[PDB]
């Protein structure tokens, strides 16, 4: 009575969606996310989880700001505008 | 022999979920939800219900 | 949802400046043993309640519709 | 054709189940165009969809049988399956009888047939026994009133 008869009682979510990573890893009763975590500003990551950093690190997402930092540096952090030329 | 349903999304027979079956002017049975009954106010000394006071639910 | 029993209290109701409308409902009923008679219902609609005046004497009904104000949007039946 | 949704709509328009609507098997082209409920309400009106009246469940063999129980039949020993307390509890029999004996005693007392001292004796013997019924109480009252008049 521990296999397919007991499997029909599984209708209560232990984990719901996380607000930091959208993962469905947020444990409801613990009030913490098992993948990133909602408590502790420190994103959950370990060195034994070598693949786990590869899915979540920088560059894996949009990089809405870091897209332009290497180009903004290359021009030496200009301010102003280009004025005019010919043609 | 006209069977009836609840009208709200509480399907359990709790204290807040009482039902009296009433006949509508459409000629059908329909359940209506009845609030929980008011107790009488009681005396501060003897504890007996004190007369001349209407028995309402407390916000009424 | 409230019956008015005083006919002169019904007449002061029609000039209460929220009663824009009314209606006169006629019901064919019997006078408690035999023959039919005409009962009429004078329903005025106030701003928060409907007042009803039942009139069994169909003669006294005739002296009441002339007593209604000329501005009331009387809906016969 | 496919008159499945005209079967479903007509059951809701008429007010019966789907087992009690009859679609005309000769007007299947006209029913197949009735895609709305205002069009179904037309097809009920000109007789294309009818109400298919209720299957009878007559109670006449009950009412004929129930008359014979009133006349006294079918109550022999081979027709009872429950215990005597199951068919009629002895507490209910006692409740019927003791409410009778209290009611005649209260009726006799305020009518002036018996007084208050004879009542209070008869109230506690009736709560006990030896008044099996209303007859056995009345012949006791008749005797005790006549004996107290004989004692007077």
């Amino acid at each position: 009575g521990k296999g397919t008869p007991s499997f029909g009682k599984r209708h209560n979510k232990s984990h719901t969606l996380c607000n930091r990573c959208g993962r469905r890893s947020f444990h409801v009763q613990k009030k913490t996310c098992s993948s990133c975590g909602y408590p502790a500003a420190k994103t959950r990551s370990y060195n034994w989880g070598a693949k786990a950093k590869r899915r979540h690190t920088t560059g894996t997402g949009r990089m809405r700001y870091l897209k332009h930092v290497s180009r903004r540096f290359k021009n030496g952090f200009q301010t102003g505008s280009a004025s005019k030329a010919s043609a | 022999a006209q069977r009836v349903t609840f009208r709200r999304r509480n399907p359990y027979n709790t204290r807040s979920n009482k039902i009296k079956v009433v006949k509508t002017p459409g000629g059908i049975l329909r359940a209506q939800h009845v609030k929980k009954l008011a107790t009488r106010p009681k005396c501060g000394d003897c504890g007996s219900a004190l007369q001349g006071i209407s028995t309402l639910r407390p916000r009424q | 949802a409230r019956e008015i029993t005083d006919i002169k209290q019904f007449l002061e109701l029609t000039r209460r400046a929220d009663v824009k409308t009314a209606t006169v409902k006629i019901n064919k009923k019997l006078n408690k043993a035999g023959k039919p008679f005409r009962q009429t219902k004078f329903k005025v609609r106030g701003s928060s309640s409907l007042y009803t005046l039942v009139i069994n004497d169909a003669g006294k009904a005739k002296k009441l519709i002339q007593s209604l104000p000329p501005t009331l949007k009387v809906n016969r039946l | 054709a496919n008159l499945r949704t005209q079967k479903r709509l007509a059951a809701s328009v008429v007010g019966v189940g789907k087992r009690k609507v009859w679609l005309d098997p000769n007007e299947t082209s006209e029913i197949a165009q009735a895609n709305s409920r205002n069009a179904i309400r037309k097809l009920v009106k000109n007789g294309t969809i009818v109400k298919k009246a209720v299957t009878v469940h007559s109670k006449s063999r009950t009412r004929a049988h129930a008359q014979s129980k009133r006349e006294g039949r079918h109550s022999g020993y081979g027709k009872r399956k429950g215990t005597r307390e199951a068919r009629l509890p002895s507490q209910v029999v006692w409740i019927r009888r003791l409410r009778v004996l209290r009611r005649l005693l209260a009726k006799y007392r305020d009518a002036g047939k018996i007084d208050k001292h004879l009542y209070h004796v008869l109230y506690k013997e009736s709560k006990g026994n030896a008044f099996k019924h209303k007859r056995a109480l009345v012949e006791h009252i008749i005797q005790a009133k006549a004996d107290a008049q004989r004692e007077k």
Binding site: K13, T16, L17, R24 | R9 | - | -
Partner: protein
């Protein structure tokens, strides 16, 4: 579920719009290699897991 939060109804609203095939003009594009929608979901073949 049948009485939901908005954060759950928002995620079905998105996954409803992703329940469609390719637009068929996509396959006519220059150097287009997309042959079919390879992320199509169905409710009785793979649950969303919320």
């Amino acid at each position: 579920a049948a009485q939901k939060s908005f954060r759950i109804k928002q995620k079905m609203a998105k996954a409803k719009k992703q329940n469609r095939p390719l637009p068929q003009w996509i396959r006519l594009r220059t150097n287009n290699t997309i042959r079919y929608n390879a992320k199509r979901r169905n409710w009785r073949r793979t649950k969303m897991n919320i």
